[PDB]
Amino acid sequence: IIAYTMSLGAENSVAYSNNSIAIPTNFTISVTTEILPVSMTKTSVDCTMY
Amino acid sequence: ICGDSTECSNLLLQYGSFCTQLNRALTGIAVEQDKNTQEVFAQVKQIYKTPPIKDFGGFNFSQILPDPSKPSKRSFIEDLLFNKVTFNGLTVLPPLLTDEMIAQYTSALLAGTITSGWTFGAGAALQIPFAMQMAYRFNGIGVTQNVLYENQKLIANQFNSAIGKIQDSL
Amino acid sequence: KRVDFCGKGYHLMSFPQSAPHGVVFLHVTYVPAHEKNFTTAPAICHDGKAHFPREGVFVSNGTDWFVTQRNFYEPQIITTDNTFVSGNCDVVIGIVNN
Amino acid sequence: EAEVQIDRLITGRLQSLQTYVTQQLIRAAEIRASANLAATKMSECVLGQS
Ligand SMILES: *[C@@H]1O[C@H](CO)[C@@H](O[C@@H]2O[C@H](CO)[C@@H](O)[C@H](O)[C@H]2NC(C)=O)[C@H](O)[C@H]1NC(C)=O
Ligand SMILES: *[C@@H]1O[C@H](CO)[C@@H](O[C@@H]2O[C@H](CO)[C@@H](O)[C@H](O)[C@H]2NC(C)=O)[C@H](O)[C@H]1NC(C)=O
Ligand SMILES: *[C@@H]1O[C@H](CO)[C@@H](O[C@@H]2O[C@H](CO)[C@@H](O)[C@H](O)[C@H]2NC(C)=O)[C@H](O)[C@H]1NC(C)=O
Ligand SMILES: *[C@@H]1O[C@H](CO)[C@@H](O[C@@H]2O[C@H](CO)[C@@H](O)[C@H](O)[C@H]2NC(C)=O)[C@H](O)[C@H]1NC(C)=O
Ligand SMILES: *[C@@H]1O[C@H](CO)[C@@H](O[C@@H]2O[C@H](CO)[C@@H](O)[C@H](O)[C@H]2NC(C)=O)[C@H](O)[C@H]1NC(C)=O
Ligand SMILES: *[C@@H]1O[C@H](CO)[C@@H](O[C@@H]2O[C@H](CO)[C@@H](O)[C@H](O)[C@H]2NC(C)=O)[C@H](O)[C@H]1NC(C)=O
Numbered sequence A: 001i002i003a004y005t006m007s008l009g010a011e012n013s014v015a016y017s018n019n020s021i022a023i024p025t026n027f028t029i030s031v032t033t034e035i036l037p038v039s040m041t042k043t044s045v046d047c048t049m050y
Numbered sequence B: 001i002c003g004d005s006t007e008c009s010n011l012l013l014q015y016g017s018f019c020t021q022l023n024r025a026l027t028g029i030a031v032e033q034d035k036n037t038q039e040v041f042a043q044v045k046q047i048y049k050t051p052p053i054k055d056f057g058g059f060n061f062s063q064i065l066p067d068p069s070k071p072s073k074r075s076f077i078e079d080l081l082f083n084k085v086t087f088n089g090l091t092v093l094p095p096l097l098t099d100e101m102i103a104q105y106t107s108a109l110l111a112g113t114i115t116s117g118w119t120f121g122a123g124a125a126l127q128i129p130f131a132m133q134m135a136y137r138f139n140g141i142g143v144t145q146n147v148l149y150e151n152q153k154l155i156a157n158q159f160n161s162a163i164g165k166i167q168d169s170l
Numbered sequence C: 001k002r003v004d005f006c007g008k009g010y011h012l013m014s015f016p017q018s019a020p021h022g023v024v025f026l027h028v029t030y031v032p033a034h035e036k037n038f039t040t041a042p043a044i045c046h047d048g049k050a051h052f053p054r055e056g057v058f059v060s061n062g063t064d065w066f067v068t069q070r071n072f073y074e075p076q077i078i079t080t081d082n083t084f085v086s087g088n089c090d091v092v093i094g095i096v097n098n
Numbered sequence D: 001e002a003e004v005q006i007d008r009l010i011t012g013r014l015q016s017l018q019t020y021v022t023q024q025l026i027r028a029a030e031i032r033a034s035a036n037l038a039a040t041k042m043s044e045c046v047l048g049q050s
Helices: B006-013 B020-041 B074-085 B099-115 B130-142 B145-150 B152-169 D003-045
Strands: A010-012 A020-037 B047-048 C010-018 C022-039 C044-046 C049-053 C057-059 C066-070 C072-076 C083-088
Touching: A020 C057, B006 D003, B020 B099, B020 D003, B047 B099, B074 B152, B130 B145, B145 B152, B145 C049, B145 C083
Parallel strands: A010 B047, A020 C072
Antiparallel strands: A020 C022, C010 C022, C044 C049, C049 C083, C057 C066, C066 C072
């Protein structure tokens, strides 16, 4: 077991210039999933029984 | 409740579990706070850095970019904001993310939005000169880029004056 | 159209799926890749007039200059049909001459 | 009767603790709503034009 300092991620220096751009030439299609709860179990309680 | 008394502890024992759920709720709250900060701030896969040379068509971001001189690596406005705002069985737990990491996230976000426009939010950041990003953004609201390219200096001066005024007002 | 509301990338469509106590969304998104470097100019001075693209951006592979759409590399020759004129080439900062 | 007195103290302190916990829960729900709004605003207005 090792304890360390967490890393926020990698680091890159984007090549900025006042007369240069970057344009994509290809593409991909991605399918992602997300999950959302919408309901919970319906419960009932009786006093005199409890 | 008891403050290190054996008889008090014994008497409290016969109340069942009135204390497991209290601590459970508090721990849930703390985890929720950590998740809140993480999801509001951590939204970039990489940490971008601004180029050493800064010629953004006349716009001046020096008041907002991080200052390497200070140990905290915070901008002028962040320092102003930080300066302006001010045991009996209870403890306070430190947040998971320290202030330096939050400042680093903000710096990365702001460098990415200056350099690559909105492209870095979908795929890989693509560089583009800032004036062209302004032209695209004017084209967004129904004004042709003609207007921007013909009034660059006035727009830059208005932006700089607005940022100075907001600095002074804050 | 609101960014990042459903899926990371440019949204295309979504499909719902039932879950025991919730719902599952499958989002289909478009992600560009294989970028390339190019040289850029904001407008073109021709015959003393300034030309701006109707929709796209000017690029060049070293020479000859082309107009492309902003999300997919597809160069085309520059023509008066896909450009419009505004004034003269005297106030724009970055005019190139072609 | 020390047990009686301690019982009164115990129930009072327990009630106070319960009140504090409930107030904390309400405030936490409100803060979570605010944080969700902040996340949506930052995703929609910083990473793109709205
Ligand atoms: C585009 O041009 C740059 C400039 O030569 C290429 O080089 C990169 O420059 C940046 C900024 O200095 C560095 O951070 C990268 O490490 C450089 N890449 C190298 C050395 O391979 C860049 O590769 C070109 N292509 C892209 C897609 O940016
Ligand atoms: C865009 O990317 C796709 C996917 O990588 C490329 O399609 C592949 O092309 C190679 C070369 O012909 C084939 O061997 C693979 O079988 C292809 N993949 C599939 C899934 O069909 C495509 O060539 C790329 N296009 C460009 C212009 O770079
Ligand atoms: C951006 O604005 C800042 C204002 O803070 C400018 O910094 C000032 O520059 C003047 C002129 O050199 C100095 O007299 C001030 O002392 C500077 N103020 C501070 C706080 O350093 C900065 O020069 C502007 N950026 C550019 C590129 O001009
Ligand atoms: C930039 O792209 C253009 C468009 O293809 C190139 O022009 C043609 O290049 C091919 C291949 O070299 C030649 O066979 C044609 O004769 C060229 N057309 C003309 C009108 O000259 C151009 O060579 C490319 N430039 C660079 C530096 O890659
Ligand atoms: C974009 O940046 C370049 C830096 O490479 C600027 O080019 C300089 O322009 C001035 C004014 O003509 C010259 O005195 C310098 O010698 C140029 N620098 C170099 C390295 O050649 C350019 O002015 C900037 N603006 C544009 C292209 O619109
Ligand atoms: C576009 O063409 C014009 C016309 O040839 C160039 O303007 C000339 O610039 C030189 C250098 O200042 C002057 O001596 C000429 O009198 C100009 N001719 C004119 C105004 O008709 C212009 O330089 C070219 N574009 C670029 C970016 O160089």
